[PDB]
Structures are given as structure tokens and as C-alpha cells.
Enzyme design. Structure first.
Site, PDB file in Angstrom:
ATOM      1  N   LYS A  40       0.791  -1.231   0.000  1.00  0.00           N
ATOM      2  CA  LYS A  40       0.000   0.000   0.000  1.00  0.00           C
ATOM      3  C   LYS A  40       0.821   1.278   0.000  1.00  0.00           C
ATOM      4  CE  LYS A  40      -4.348  -1.349   0.123  1.00  0.00           C
ATOM      5  NZ  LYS A  40      -4.112  -2.648   0.776  1.00  0.00           N
ATOM      6  N   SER A 263      -2.941 -12.434   3.978  1.00  0.00           N
ATOM      7  CA  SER A 263      -3.328 -12.460   2.571  1.00  0.00           C
ATOM      8  C   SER A 263      -2.301 -13.197   1.711  1.00  0.00           C
ATOM      9  CB  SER A 263      -3.538 -11.036   2.038  1.00  0.00           C
ATOM     10  OG  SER A 263      -2.342 -10.275   2.069  1.00  0.00           O
TER      11      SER A 263
HETATM   12  C1  LIG Z   1      -4.140  -3.717  -0.027  1.00  0.00           C
HETATM   13  C2  LIG Z   1      -3.868  -5.162   0.366  1.00  0.00           C
HETATM   14  C3  LIG Z   1      -4.174  -6.199  -0.528  1.00  0.00           C
HETATM   15  C4  LIG Z   1      -4.789  -5.958  -1.942  1.00  0.00           C
HETATM   16  O1  LIG Z   1      -4.055  -5.062  -2.859  1.00  0.00           O
HETATM   17  P1  LIG Z   1      -4.928  -4.086  -3.780  1.00  0.00           P
HETATM   18  O2  LIG Z   1      -4.005  -3.389  -4.808  1.00  0.00           O
HETATM   19  O3  LIG Z   1      -5.576  -3.075  -2.913  1.00  0.00           O
HETATM   20  O4  LIG Z   1      -5.864  -4.969  -4.512  1.00  0.00           O
HETATM   21  C5  LIG Z   1      -3.935  -7.488  -0.164  1.00  0.00           C
HETATM   22  N1  LIG Z   1      -3.393  -7.774   1.070  1.00  0.00           N
HETATM   23  C6  LIG Z   1      -3.086  -6.779   1.949  1.00  0.00           C
HETATM   24  C7  LIG Z   1      -2.479  -7.164   3.303  1.00  0.00           C
HETATM   25  C8  LIG Z   1      -3.323  -5.460   1.603  1.00  0.00           C
HETATM   26  O5  LIG Z   1      -3.032  -4.449   2.478  1.00  0.00           O
END
Ligand SMILES: *Cc1c(COP(=O)(O)O)cnc(C)c1O
Ligand SMILES: *Cc1c(COP(=O)(O)O)cnc(C)c1O
Lengths: 302, 302
Positions: A40, A263
């Protein structure tokens, strides 16, 4: 240079233990190595820089920025606001963990805790109210094209270059949609056969035609289709379960030395599935949004 | 490549808000951006690679490595042991925080909790006992020359190159002594006038001729003079207090967007003192051992 200048140019590693001989190569770009701790940092910087370029903002002005987020985007925005002299206000449900509040406050962000019962809705409402009352700038991460542009101009080129243009599939767990859209477009313009596969929680599988729901993959799977997600780019959607992703994330840490976030476990799990489908010789690329550092007090590493 | 290949090549940022016009430039190298989260990734990798080169170890062997540490070196060693297939045993006092134990265990390190009353002594004793019983390899971070070599071959060259050979003073908060010795030697061989200044806690000021004591700068100030510290390189020693360093670390996060660790607050505080002494035009370089991520449950950010 300043901290914003240290964003990006992250490394890509090739998995060697959690993969099997019948799988294509699996490469993981480590976005947790950014100064703000996650991918981010890129859209946070791009949205602010874009606002400066358009004349909305001027650095060192003390101007107000407001956004309804307590996640990685909040951390990235707080870091940039601190470095460039902006007053940042982040709205979020009052049930926010003390740990996360401490990180955001460390960067000087002002936190406004909203109705725990109205959840994200109340957070969005307060951000809009502040934007109107103060004439503040709201990045609007789910709709701001500068988010996508960050990845089209940096993340994508970096991934493509590091893997010498040899990528058969790009796999990513979508949140705002910026990464998969930006990187996806960059790759498809150069690799005629590349497949772009989105990953989402089985518990909040809206891209798959399912329904939103609570899940543990912090940062991805917003429960809705964001404006920054270009569905026409997708060649498929893989649904993942925490029951499968978390044990895998633990294997990545213990067998690859890759201590990643929640994630990342889901994204890599999906990448392995795609790798088995493509087979030896092929190359699957995916991205780890962040490291495991912010998740020691979660089921993943607790 | 693998995770160990992602170690190093960290960025250097120039402070712009906590500094004053009458100070020399102050540059900070961000070692928290390493995959293991700290500067220790470098000596951890070098000590293991050196052991492989000398024939003590062979990767993927399952051979045992033992070290009495629960800090950044433990994290770095755990990451490398996970990636290269070694069984790592870390000894540490039983009063170790759950948070830290979770990070180490995430990487697959085996933890042996020793007598809380005997502190570090009991940890050292158990590591020696295991080394003898298992014929294990003990990195021995405070005496292993490969620790120093890591910095002489990577950290130093990187710092020198990034600052275009223009450095008037190098400031660092010594722990094992590897960084200040390795970087210090590299710089002194090329910059005839460069000053190397060590930083230590006023509460455990042994380099200053004082006495060891408990302090809050995790990672630095071991309370003794390690074999890896070359005293002949030092042009001075600055003693720092948590009372001064912690508020400064908070300013760095809120005013520079630099969310750093406890030792970084002390190191930068000292760097500012040196910067005021040298004056405008001059350049002071220092290193941030790690970020603030592991310290949200400490007085610094709590
Ligand atoms: C933002 C984020 C995502 C997804 O990325 P995007 O470009 O917003 O789709 C996945 N995992 C985490 C931990 C994130 O902060
Ligand atoms: C290791 C460490 C230091 C000191 O570096 P050395 O090369 O061992 O002198 C300082 N701060 C932290 C947080 C560390 O982990």
C-alpha cells in the site's frame, strides 16, 4: 532522499520447498519490505503525489487528508502525510485493535473511532462528513485511478523486468483492485498469453458470484467489486479458505524463511494451484502484500 | 533467488525535520527493510555462509545450529536456517515475551527457556552444553569475524556508494561490534578524515569507563566489550538516555515518516549531537538497526 523515495524496487524470490516437481516455477514479490510495511505504500504515495500534481495539495501545507481505513493504506498514508507535512485523519470502527491504533498514531495520524455497530459504513460516513466540513482531500482508494497507476508504472515494470518477461500467470488477492489491474494491464500489453488470476476469500466470494462475509485475510476481499478492479482483465478467480492458507503461510515461514501476512498465505496457496495446472517449465508470479510482523496476535501465528 | 538473496541493498534517507539549519546533513540507512526485519540479517547470513565455506556446514543437511539469543540475531538465524535447511536451537531466559517467541517459532526455531534468575549466563551455558552434546555449530555472534566481514563487504560499501564517498562522521549504537568495526574500517580506508563514533546507553556505559546496567535500547549496549569491536577505530563514544531517545524516535515517526526501533532513537539522537558539532556542509551518516514493528508493546510506542 526522503522515505517516500524508498518505496518500491522490492525483491522477488522463488519458492523451493512448498512447491512440487510437477508445478511451474512460483515467484513471490515481497512488498512487505517497503518502508510502510506493505504494498500500500505505492498507492498511498501515488494518490498523494497525483493530488499534488493536480493542484489539490501542496506539500508542507498542513492540508488535511481524510480516509476511512485502519489497514495498510492507513499506514502508508500516515507515513507519507508525516513525511510531506499533511494532517491525516483516519476514520475506523471503535473496535479497532490497540496494536493497529498504536502504529497509526506513531505516524501522527489522528484517529476518529466510529459506531462499532455500523462498521465500515459509519467510518465511510464520518470521512465524507469531514471531507465536506474541512474541504479535505479524500484519497478514495477504491476508486482513485492513481492507485492503479502506481502499479502500472512501478510494480508491474519491476515484476516484468525481474522475471525477464517470462511470466505465464500472474496471481493476486484483490483488495482495492489497484494491483491486479495495474500489473495485469502492464503484463497483458507485453505477454500475449499471460493469465491474470484473481484470488478472494471463499467466505466473501463476490467475484465468484457468491456473497460477502467475514473472513481472516486482512487487506483483501472487501466484500464488493471496487471501481479500480478491471474485470475484463481476469482469466479466472480462485477462492481460498483460511483453513488451507494459514497452515501454508506457516510452512512458508518455516520452510522458505518467508514470514508473510495473512493475505500472502491465501495468494500463494492459489498460486500453487495455478502452478500445478500449468506444469514444469512454466512460470507463475504472485505478490506478497505484507510480512507477518503485524499479525503475531492473530490465529496465523498465535 | 531465495530470501537470503534479498538481504541488503537498503536505502538511506536524509532527515529534514528533526534537524536544524546549524547542523551537518544527517543520513540514516534503513536496515529494518531487510527480510528478517533488521541489520542482523547480514551477520546471520555471513556467519552461516562462512561456516558452509569452511566445511563446517552444508545446506539442506538438517545440521544443528545453536546460539544464545532471542533478539534480531535469533530472527536472522531462524530465517536463514529455515531457508537453507538447518535445525536451529535458540537459548534464552524464560521471561521472554510471548510476542518474540512467536516470531522465532514462526521461522521454525526451537526455543530452550533457561533459568530466569541466571539471565544471559544460563542461556550461554545451555548453548555451550548443546554445542558439546550435539556437536552443533554455534555462530558466536560476539566473536565471529564473519560478523564484521558482513559489514566490511556489504553495509560499508553500500553506505559509501550511496553518499558518494562524502562522509565526515559515522555514528552507530554498538551491540556485537560487527557493524561499527566493519563499516568503520571500510570508511577509514577511504576517507582519511572520517570520524567513527560509538553510541551506548548511559545506563550501561562500559565503553565510556562506566558500568553495565539494565536499559531499554534493545539490540545495543551488551554491558561488555565484545571481541568483534575494534576499539582502535573509535574517535569517541556518546552516551544516550531513553528519556531523550524515545521522544526523538516518536518525532522521527511523526515528522519524517520514519517508524524506527528503540536503538535507532538513541543512534539518531547521538548523530544529531555530532551534526551540530560539525556544522553545515558536513555529512553525518548513521544506521537504523530496525523498524518500530517489533516494539508496539514497549514504552516507545505504547
Ligand atoms: C491492499 C492489500 C491487498 C490488496 O491489494 P490491492 O491493490 O488493494 O488490490 C492485499 N493484502 C493486503 C495485506 C493489503 O493491504
Ligand atoms: C544488533 C543490533 C544492534 C547493534 O549492531 P551490531 O553490529 O551487533 O553492533 C543495534 N540495534 C539493534 C536493534 C540490533 O539488533
Amino acid at each position: 532522499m526522503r522515505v517516500e523515495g524508498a518505496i518500491g524496487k522490492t525483491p522477488v524470490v522463488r519458492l523451493a520447498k512448498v512447491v512440487e516437481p510437477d508445478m511451474a516455477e512460483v515467484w513471490v514479490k515481497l512488498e512487505g519490505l517497503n518502508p510502510g510495511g506493505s504494498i500500500k505504500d505505492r498507492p498511498a504515495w501515488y494518490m498523494i503525489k497525483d493530488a499534488e500534481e493536480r493542484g489539490i495539495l501542496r506539500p508542507g501545507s498542513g492540508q488535511v487528508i481524510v480516509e476511512p481505513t485502519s489497514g495498510n493504506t492507513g499506514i502508508g498514508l500516515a507515513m507519507i502525510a508525516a513525511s510531506r507535512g499533511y494532517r491525516l485523519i483516519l476514520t475506523m470502527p471503535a473496535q479497532m485493535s490497540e496494536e493497529r491504533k498504536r502504529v497509526l498514531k506513531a505516524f501522527g495520524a489522528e484517529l476518529v473511532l466510529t459506531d462499532p455497530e455500523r462498521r465500515m459504513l459509519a467510518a465511510r460516513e464520518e470521512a465524507l462528513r469531514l471531507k465536506e466540513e474541512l474541504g479535505a482531500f479524500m484519497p478514495d482508494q477504491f476508486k482513485n485511478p492513481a492507485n492503479v497507476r502506481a502499479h502500472y508504472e512501478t510494480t508491474g515494470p519491476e515484476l516484468y523486468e525481474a522475471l525477464e518477461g517470462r511470466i505465464d500467470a500472474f496471481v493476486y488477492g484483490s483488495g482495492t483492485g489497484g494491483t491486479i489491474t495495474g500489473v495485469g494491464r502492464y503484463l497483458k500489453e507485453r505477454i500475449p498469453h499471460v493469465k491474470v488470476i484473481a484470488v478472494e476469500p471463499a467466505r466473501s466470494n463476490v467475484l465468484s458470484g457468491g456473497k460477502m462475509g467475514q473472513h481472516g485475510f486482512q487487506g483483501m476481499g472487501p466484500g464488493f467489486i471496487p471501481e479500480n478492479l478491471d474485470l475484463s482483465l481476469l482469466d479466472g478467480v480462485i477462492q481460498v479458505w483460511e483453513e488451507d492458507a494459514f497452515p501454508l503461510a506457516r510452512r512458508l515461514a518455516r520452510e522458505e524463511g518467508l514470514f508473510l501476512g495473512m493475505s500472502s498465505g491465501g495468494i500463494v496457496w492459489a498460486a500453487l494451484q495455478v502452478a500445478r495446472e500449468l506444469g514444469p517449465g512454466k512460470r507463475v508470479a504472485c505478490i506478497s502484500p505484507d510480512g507477518g510482523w503485524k499479525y503475531l496476535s492473530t490465529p496465523l501465528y498465535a
